[PDB]
Design a protein around this ligand. Sequence first.
Ligand SMILES: [Zn+2]
Length: 42
Amino acid sequence: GSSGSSGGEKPYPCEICGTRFRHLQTLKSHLRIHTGSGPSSG
Ligand SMILES: [Zn+2]
């Protein structure tokens, strides 16, 4: 259906893949594995 908040667990769905995260601040860090071509971020 619609995309956005959920209202329970991981109301902050990822933008790259989609994997949600209990908290937002956390998700932002989950984007590190998504973007990072080279010696940066691994
Ligand atoms: Zn993701």
